[PDB]
Structure 1
Amino acid sequence: ATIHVDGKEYEVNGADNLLEACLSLGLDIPYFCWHPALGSVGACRQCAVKQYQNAEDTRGRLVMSCMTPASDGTFISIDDEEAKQFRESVVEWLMTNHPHDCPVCEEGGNCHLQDMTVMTGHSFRRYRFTKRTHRNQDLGPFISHEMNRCIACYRCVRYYKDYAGGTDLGVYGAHDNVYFGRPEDGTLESEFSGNLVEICPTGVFTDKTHSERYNRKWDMQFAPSICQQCSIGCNISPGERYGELRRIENRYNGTVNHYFLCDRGRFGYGYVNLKDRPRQPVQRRGDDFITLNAEQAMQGAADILRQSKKVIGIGSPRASVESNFALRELVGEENFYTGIAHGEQERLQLALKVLREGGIYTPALREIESYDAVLVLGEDVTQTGARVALAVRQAVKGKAREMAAAQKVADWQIAAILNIGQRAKHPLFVTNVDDTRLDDIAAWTYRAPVEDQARLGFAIAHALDNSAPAVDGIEPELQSKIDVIVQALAGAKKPLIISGTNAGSLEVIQAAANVAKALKGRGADVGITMIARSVNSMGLGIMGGGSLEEALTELETGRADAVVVLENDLHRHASATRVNAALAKAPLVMVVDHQRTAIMENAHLVLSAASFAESDGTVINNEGRAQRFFQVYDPAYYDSKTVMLESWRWLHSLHSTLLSREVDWTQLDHVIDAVVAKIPELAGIKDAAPDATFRIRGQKLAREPHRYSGRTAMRANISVHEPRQPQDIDTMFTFSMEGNNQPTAHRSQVPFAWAPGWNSPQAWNKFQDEVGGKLRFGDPGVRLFETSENGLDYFTSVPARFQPQDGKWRIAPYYHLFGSDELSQRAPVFQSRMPQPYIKLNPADAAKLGVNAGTRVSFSYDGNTVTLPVEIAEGLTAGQVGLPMGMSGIAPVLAGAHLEDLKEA
């Protein structure tokens, strides 16, 4: 299309509206109610431009640029006097009731309303009357509510209800008393309620965890990191002040997690700021815990390891690729053990084999929203991979999108699209042991044990393709539901099958692979998504190694007299008694970790490793994309006694001190080169980010904004002399404002978004090639593998149906977004949000055992009797007891295990 803005000709996309087209050209139009991910509604009336009928026209007409298509031969003006006057008047009308609150408001310096008040040029107040006032509500531990600052732009309700599918936030009231919030005081129930603090252009919804230790945006030190709380790998901007991690903001990635995070990633960072974290290397001598610096710790550990006869290393999916590879190099390839159990490793390797050898294209997180039918097998996506559940909701609304596009309704006219596609939606079929949070939009839900869900998947694959193995013993009603699912999936242009390792069953993954292969054999555009558990579970699966049971066997048998545990608590993947006995039998335990774990009481040496905020590295997310995360701040800048290094740096220095009796720490690119040279499967991690010599016209990339303050006073209480600026030899970023953060800089890693006049998260519009699209020079992250030329064979291992045996109870896994991830429960703001530790019982089984709801029952697992209160679960099948995975005392390895002597105490 051809448009003419202020007499200047531009080529745009005709399917776009004028606001996003002009913002993609770099032109500045103020806007409040429009969002790139939410569409246009024409509410705030801020984006007014003046449209002319043709080339010669002097009158014009004030039109709404978000509601006006950028058709061919359009003529508009932004800097027209009437348009500028009306935009200033709209800002003035919004500012009539706005409270005098900017000094004590957490959106100050980050406020879109502040930016657009300044940008319209409105600074003189002629309104002399009163301002309307609203009482506030308690929205939970994460979101702070202040309704006085609202401009009634309707972004919160649109996102939370239409986009995120939430049901507890709405708009109430009338003419100028419109209230945006919950119908009563209570926690916001949605798993994506944290994105309200970026969706809201004002300070109505604010990050309360950030508000506890608040600092302004210009005072932050930012880095581009990867969220470490599940396997999705959402791009984040951690921001730091005064030596503590202060906030997690959403960093735009047009391929993964474009504008939105989930609440676990946005509020689960608080384990970084814990005061019990190790800050120095500590050696246990008898009962004393003496403190070493880095060199003496390296020398002593190297000496003791040199006297040992066999040193084994236990990695973890918490640690990055470089840390796991450095441990593997230190202990040897045959002595390296992955930190997960045998069953977890088997499921992880099967999911990896399906992903990179099944011949079916695994989509990115943004690409999930374009699939025409979704089948989720076994995985509770909202509690394990929540952003995938959000993308599934968008893919479900794709049917209404298609129905409106068939009537020549523009794709940004979201209200007309929702009116046309009233309740018609793409088919979603979810299977779980109980109800899921996707059930409000799912076409069907199957509450059944994991064997029965696997049998349902195998039956779907057999009904789609007769060469697939069949399932005998299907009820006629279940067969009717099976053929409903099959007719929905076969008629879909782009079917998507989502499974994962969290179901605790190999057969569920096999059934999902069979369904994907059967859909591929019919010529469909099938995609498959596998949800892993931890941040680098795919990386540890690709690198591979022995299971934790083999490492414990080597420690118990005495064949290994030294164990190096890297970033692992060892209790989520094995029984605590066995781990404690094996570690007590080992004459040397050496734990390299950044969180105070329970296995350090018997550890002979403890290395204070760095968390993701204080380390650089690479992680592989669930889709097989390698992504680099960068250090946010130097932990030794404020406390000079703090010796906290990267895990790969620690282990490479230990290997050097063991071999040549000398200390060499590393550079990060050296470890990256070692990984891509010795492991050809991980050879794609080199292109995840450029090396430390990458420059933008000769200068590095700035971590903090150019108006970063307090440089000569923030450390003045320790010493009046300003210290050396910290040197970052590992990466291309500098720990200072002396760098480049231009929107037009030829780079992909953006630590934070800021443009002059755009201080809010709307500066990402300046950082993109087109608004709502990708980054200008591509998104960071490179897929490790392409899709295979040939697929796998059908999995013939069809399990039998679940038989409830007497005296035993099958443990059904229950996952929580707040509580199941290991590092997130350590965050003290999560204890107000994590549910009470329950045990889920079927009503028939609870009546058989004579237990009501809330009474305490005691069960013994691995000879350890623990007691939990009973919650009645209607959807849980009998013979199963439901346990909350990843909580205190309940390892996630317990999924699918049998429970004995479950009896009321």
Structure 2
Amino acid sequence: ATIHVDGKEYEVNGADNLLEACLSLGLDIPYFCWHPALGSVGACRQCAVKQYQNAEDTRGRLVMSCMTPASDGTFISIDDEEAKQFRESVVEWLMTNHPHDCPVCEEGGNCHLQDMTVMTGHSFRRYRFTKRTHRNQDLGPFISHEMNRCIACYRCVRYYKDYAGGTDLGVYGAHDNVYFGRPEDGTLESEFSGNLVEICPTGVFTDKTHSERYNRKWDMQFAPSICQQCSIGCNISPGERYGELRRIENRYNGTVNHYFLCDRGRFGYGYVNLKDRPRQPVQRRGDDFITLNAEQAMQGAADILRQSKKVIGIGSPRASVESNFALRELVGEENFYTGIAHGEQERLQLALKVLREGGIYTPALREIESYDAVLVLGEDVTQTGARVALAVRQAVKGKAREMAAAQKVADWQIAAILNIGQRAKHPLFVTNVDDTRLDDIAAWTYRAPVEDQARLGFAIAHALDNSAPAVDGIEPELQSKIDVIVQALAGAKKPLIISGTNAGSLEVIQAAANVAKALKGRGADVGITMIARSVNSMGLGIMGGGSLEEALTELETGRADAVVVLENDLHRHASATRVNAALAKAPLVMVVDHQRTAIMENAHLVLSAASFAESDGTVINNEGRAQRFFQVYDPAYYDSKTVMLESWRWLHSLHSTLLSREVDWTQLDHVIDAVVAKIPELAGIKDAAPDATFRIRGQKLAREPHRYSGRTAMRANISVHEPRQPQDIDTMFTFSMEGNNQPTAHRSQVPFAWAPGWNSPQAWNKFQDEVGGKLRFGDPGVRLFETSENGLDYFTSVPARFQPQDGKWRIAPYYHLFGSDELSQRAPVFQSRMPQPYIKLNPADAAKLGVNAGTRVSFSYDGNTVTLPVEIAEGLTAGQVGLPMGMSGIAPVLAGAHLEDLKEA
């Protein structure tokens, strides 16, 4: 289609409305209620443009550019006097009841309403009467609520209900007394409530964690990074001020995490700002604790390493690719051990084998929203990989989108989309040990142990293609449900199969792979998705190594007299007693970490590593996409005593000092080239982000905005002489505003969104080729592997039916979004949010034990008689005990294990 704006001819996409058709070309129209992902509702009436149907038309009509399709031959005027006066009047009407709260507002300089008040040129107030006020609700530890600043643009209710699926936020009130919130006070229990701080154009829903230690947007030092709290790897923009991480903002990735994060990744950053964190290298002689800087620590570590017969290294799925590779090259290829256990590594290797060898195209997170029928086997997505659950909700609403598009309704008429599709939605079949958070839209939910879920998957795979291995012994009711799932999946056009290593079983992944292979054999565009546990689980599995049991038995047998533990707590993947014995037995433990782990008492040397905010690196998400996360700040700028370096830098300098007795602090590009040289299958991480020599017309990229303040006074308490700003030799960014952050620069890594006249999170519209689509000049991060030409065979080893053995209790994993991450539970803001540790029991088994809810049951696992209060789970199957993974003293390695001595105490 071809449109005419003010006499200028523009080629646009005719399936789009006029608002983002003009926003794609760079034409500024004020707007509040429209969002690129939600749709158009025509509420705020701010997007008015004067439309003409002929080339010679004087009057025209003031039409809504978010509600008028951009067909071929529309002559719209934006800067006309009538349209500008009406837009100014709408801004004025929104400004009649707005409070005088801008200095004391958390979105000052980040406000969409401020940008559209200055954009329309409204600065004179002739309203003289009183302003309406509203009370505020306590929405929990995350969201600060201030309803006086609202403009009734209906974005919060639209996102939270029609997009996030939440049920506790709604619109109440009257004519002008419109309220947006809960029917009472209490925590917003949705797992995607954190995006309300950027969906809301005003300062109603604000980040309370940021509001504790608050600084303005221009005071933030930003960086592009990857969220480390689970395996999805959503792109984030960490921003710091005064040496502590202040706020995690959303970063636009058109393929992964376009406009929405989750609460664990958005509010779980509080572990970085802990004072218990090691900031200097600390060495122990017996009970004496001394502090060294980098050089003497490196020389002493190299001396003790040379005085040992075999140095072993225990990596972690939390650390980056470069740091794990540095440990591997420091300790040797054969002596490198992955920090995960044997079962977790087996499930991870199977998931990687299905991904990069199964011949089935695994889709990205943006591509999930277009799949028709979704089968989730084993994985509790909403509490582990929550963004995949949100994309699953979008793919479910795709059916109503399809019926709406069949009735000649444009895609941006979202109200008509839910109008036509009242309750009809795509099939979703979830399996878990209990009820999930996806049960509101799921076509079926199977509450069963992992053996029965795996057998259900094998039954689906056999009933699709008869060459698949059959399971015998299914009840006819479950057989009818199997037939229903088969009819739903076979009749679809883009089936999706979602599994992962969080189910605690291998046969679940085998069954999901067999279902995907059977769907592929019938001639369908089937996709698969394995959700891993940690952020860099996939990269550690790709690199490989031994299990934690092998490292512990090397330490216990005496063949390893020196162990380097890289960013691992070692109690999350093994028992605490065995780890403590194997570490006290070893005469040298060197823990390189940025967190005060429990094993640092046994550590002979502690090396203060850097977290994601203070280190550069590459992480591989759950779909094989290599992504580079950059440094936000130099920790030594404010606290000059702080010797806190990148873990790969620590290990590479230790390797160099061990070899040639010289200390050589390397660069990130050298380590990246070493990875892509020694490991052929990690060669794609060179293309994840360009090197430190990349310039936009000769200059670097700025980490802080052009109006960064207090350069000559933020360090004046220590010394009045402002030092040289830190130099980033590793990456292409600089710790200064002398850099390029234009929206039209030929780059993919964007630290923050800012345009002249666009200060809100809506400033991301200028950084894309089309608004709501991919990022301009391509999205960052590349896939490590392609789809194979041929796939795997049928996994024949079906499991047996779950028969509850007396005495032994199978442990059913109950993952929580707030508490199952190793680092997110260390945040002090999650302690007021995470639930209490409850052991979950069937009513029948609790009645057999005689225990009621509330009382304490003690259970012993490897000499640890730990007591937990009891919650009753009706959906849990008999013979199991429900345990929360990742909590205090309950490791995720407990999944699938037995539990003897379960008595009331």
TM-score range, shorter chain: over 0.9
Render the CA deviation track for 1:578-630: whole Å, top value 9, x for unaligned.
00000000000000000000000010000000000000000000000000000
For 1:882 and 1:367, locate their aligned partners in 2 and report how far apart those are by CA, in whole Å.
Answer: 34
- Paired residues of 2:818 and 2:830 also in contact (CA < 8 A): yes
Q: Which residue number in structure 2 is paired with residue 823 of structure 1?
A: 823
Hey, what's the Cα distance between the residues in 2 that align with 1:784 and 1:561? 36
Deviation for aligned residue 1:53: 1.5
Q: Secondary structure of 1:727's partner?
A: coil
Q: What do residues 302-339 of structure 1 show as CA deviations (whole Å, max 9, x unaligned)?
A: 00000100000000000000000000000000000000
Distance 1:692 1:766 in 2: 25
Pairing of 1:633-652 with structure 2 (within 5 A): 633-652=633-652
Tell me, in whole angstroms, the C-alpha distance in 2 between the residues paired with 1:564 and 1:523. Answer: 50
Q: Distance in 2 between matches of 1:137 and 1:888?
A: 32
Residue 193 of structure 1 and its aligned partner are, at CA, apart by 0.1
Residue of structure 1 equivalent to 2:752 = 752
Structure 2 residue 9 is matched with structure 1 residue 9: yes
Once the two structures are superposed, residues 162-202 of structure 1 have per-residue CA deviations (whole angstroms, 9 ceiling, x without a partner) of 00000000000110000000111000010000000000000
Check whether the contact 2:858–2:903 (CA below 8 A) recurs between aligned residues. Answer: yes
Partner deviation per Cα, 1:551-570 (whole Å, 9 max, x = no partner)? 00000000000000000000
Cα offsets for 1:667-702 (capped at 9, x unmatched): 000000000000001000000000000000000000
For residues 244 and 439 of structure 2, the distance between their equivalents in structure 1, rounded to whole angstroms, comes to 39
Q: Distance in 2 between matches of 1:208 and 1:611?
A: 23
Measure, in 2, the Cα distance between the counterparts of 1:710 and 1:182: 40
Task: Give the Å deviation of 1:504.
Answer: 0.5
Write out per-residue CA displacement over residues 522-577 of structure 1, whole angstroms, 9 at most, x where no aligned residue: 00110000000001000000000000000000000000000000000000100000
Percent identity among equivalent residues?
100
Secondary structure, counterpart of 1:258 in structure 2: coil
Q: CA deviation at 1:289?
A: 1.1
Are 2:249 and 2:266, in contact at CA under 8 Å, matched by a contact in 1?
yes
Deviation for aligned residue 1:862: 1.1
Distance of 2:730 and 2:183 partners within structure 1: 51
What is the alpha-carbon distance in structure 2 between the residues aligned to residue 472 and residue 53 of structure 1?
68
1:395-434 map, 5 Å: 395-434=395-434
Query: How many angstroms apart in 2 are the aligned matches of 1:664 and 1:338?
Result: 26
Unaligned runs of 5+ in 2: none
Give the C-alpha shift of residue 276 in structure 1. Answer: 0.4
SS in structure 2 at match of 1:614: coil
Partner in structure 1 of residue 603 of structure 2: 603
Q: In the aligned structure 1, how far is the partner of 2:495 from the partner of 2:551?
A: 41
Structure 1 position 873, deviation (Å): 0.2
Match of 2:169 in 1: 169
Q: Deviations over 1:79-113 (max 9, x none)?
A: 01000000000000000000000000001000000
Q: Mapping of 1:563-578 within 5 angstroms?
A: 563-578=563-578
Distance between the aligned counterparts of 2:511 and 2:456, measured in 1?
A: 8
Alpha-carbon distance between aligned partners in 2 of 1:519 and 1:866, rounded to the nearest angstrom: 46
- Inter-partner Cα distance in structure 2 for 1:733 and 1:652: 22
Using the alignment, how far apart are the partners of 1:120 and 1:900 within structure 2? 70
Following superposition, the deviation at residue 713 of structure 1 comes to 0.3
CA distance in 2: counterparts of 1:557 and 1:204, whole angstroms = 61
Q: Work out the CA distance in 1 between the residues paired with 2:53 and 2:506.
A: 64
1:206: Cα distance to partner? 0.1
CA distance in 1, matches of 2:476, 2:568: 48
Deviation at 1:267, TM superposition (A): 0.1
Counterpart contact for 2:320–2:619, Cα < 8 Å: yes
- 1:863 Cα deviation after fit: 1.7
The Cα shift of 1:764 comes to: 0.3
> 1:19 & 1:42 partners in 2: Cα distance?
11
Aligned-residue offset at 1:296? 0.3
Q: Following TM superposition, by how much is the alpha carbon of 1:389 offset from its aligned partner in structure 2, in angstroms? A: 0.1
SS in 2 for 1:218: coil
1:776-823 CA-partner distances (Å, limit 9, x unpaired): 100000000000100001000100010100001000000000000000
**CA-CA distance at 1:385 after TM superposition:** 0.1
Q: Secondary structure at the match of 1:538?
A: helix
Contact 2:39 2:412 in 1 (8 A): yes
SS at match of 1:499: strand
Deviations 1:51-94 (A, max 9, x none): 00210000000000000000001110000100000000000000
What whole-Å deviation, never above 9, does each CA across 1:446-498 have from its counterpart, x for those lacking one? 00000000000000000000000001110000000000000000000000000
Secondary structure (helix, strand or coil) at the match of 2:806 reads coil
Distance 1:499 1:86 in 2: 53
How far 1:884 sits from its partner (Å)? 0.2
Tell me by how many angstroms 1:660 deviates: 0.1
Secondary structure of the 2:767 match is coil
* 1:182-226 CA distance string (max 9 Å, x none): 111000010000000000000000000000000010000000000
**Residues in 2 aligned to 1:862 and 1:772: alpha-carbon distance in whole angstroms:** 53
* SS of corresponding position for 1:847: helix
SS at match of 2:214: coil
Aligned to 1:506: 506
Aligned pairs, number: 905
Cα deviation for residue 153 of structure 1 reads: 0.2
Output aligned runs, 1:428-827, within 5 Å.
Answer: 428-827=428-827
Give, in angstroms, the shift of residue 277 of structure 1.
0.3
Post-superposition shift, 1:27? 0.2
Measured in 2, the distance between the counterparts of 1:571 and 1:8 equals 66
Q: Deviations over 1:11-64 (max 9, x none)?
A: 000000000100000000000000000000000000000000210000000000
CA contact (8 A) 2:53 2:73 kept: no
Distance (Å, rounded) in 2 between the aligned partners of 1:107 and 1:224: 21
Cα drift, residue 248 of structure 1: 0.3
Give the drift of 1:710. Answer: 0.2
Q: What does residue 876 of structure 2 align with?
A: 876
CA contact under 8 A between 2:373 and 2:496: conserved in structure 1? yes
Structure 2 residue matching 1:10: 3-state secondary structure: strand
Q: Distance in 2 between matches of 1:207 and 1:640?
A: 31
After superposition, the C-alpha distances for 1:85-143 in whole angstroms (9 at most, x for unaligned) are 00000000000000000000001000000000000000000000000000000000000
SS for the counterpart of 1:461 is helix
**SS state at 1:124 partner:** coil
For the residue of structure 1 that corresponds to 2:502, the secondary structure is helix
Q: Distance in 2 between matches of 1:340 and 1:446?
A: 29
Matched residues in 2 for 1:491 and 1:200: separation?
40
TM-score, normalised on structure 1? Answer: 1.00
CA–CA separation in structure 2 for the residues paired with 1:573 and 1:428: 32
Rounded to whole Å, the distance in 2 between the matches of 1:834 and 1:680 is 42
Q: Deviations over 1:220-266 (max 9, x none)?
A: 00000000000000000000000000000000000000000000000
Q: Displacement of 1:899 after TM fit?
A: 0.3
Name the CA distance, whole Å, in 2 between partners of 1:20 and 1:464. 43
Matched residue of 1:232: which SS?
coil
Deviation at 1:395, TM superposition (A): 0.1
SS of 1:135's equivalent?
Answer: coil
Q: Deviations over 1:731-787 (max 9, x none)?
A: 000000000000000000000000000000011000111000011100000000000
| Alignment of structure 1 residues 36-435 onto 2, 5 Å | 36-435=36-435
> How far apart, CA to CA, are the structure 2 residues paired with 1:74 and 1:532?
50
Q: Aligned partners of 2:263 and 2:526: how far apart in 1? A: 30
Task: Give the C-alpha shift of residue 864 in structure 1.
Answer: 1.1
1:146-165 per-residue CA deviation (whole Å, 9 max, x = no partner) reads 00000000000000000000
Q: CA RMSD in A?
A: 0.3
Structure 1 Cα separation of the partners of residues 174 and 309 of structure 2: 78
Return the alpha-carbon distance in structure 1 between the equivalents of residues 602 and 316 of structure 2: 19
Give the Cα–Cα distance (whole angstroms) in 2 for the partners of residues 668 and 173 of structure 1. Answer: 56
> Are the equivalent residues in 1 in contact too, given 2:362–2:623 (CA < 8 A)?
yes
* Structure 1: 4+ residue segments shifted above 6 A: none
Q: Which residue pairs with 1:843 in the alignment?
A: 843
Distance (whole Å) between structure 2 residues aligned to residue 631 and residue 684 of structure 1: 21
For residues 827 and 628 of structure 1, the distance between their equivalents in structure 2, rounded to whole angstroms, comes to 24
Q: CA deviation at 1:640?
A: 0.3
Task: Provide the rounded CA distance (Å) in 1 between the counterparts of 2:284 and 2:683.
Answer: 39
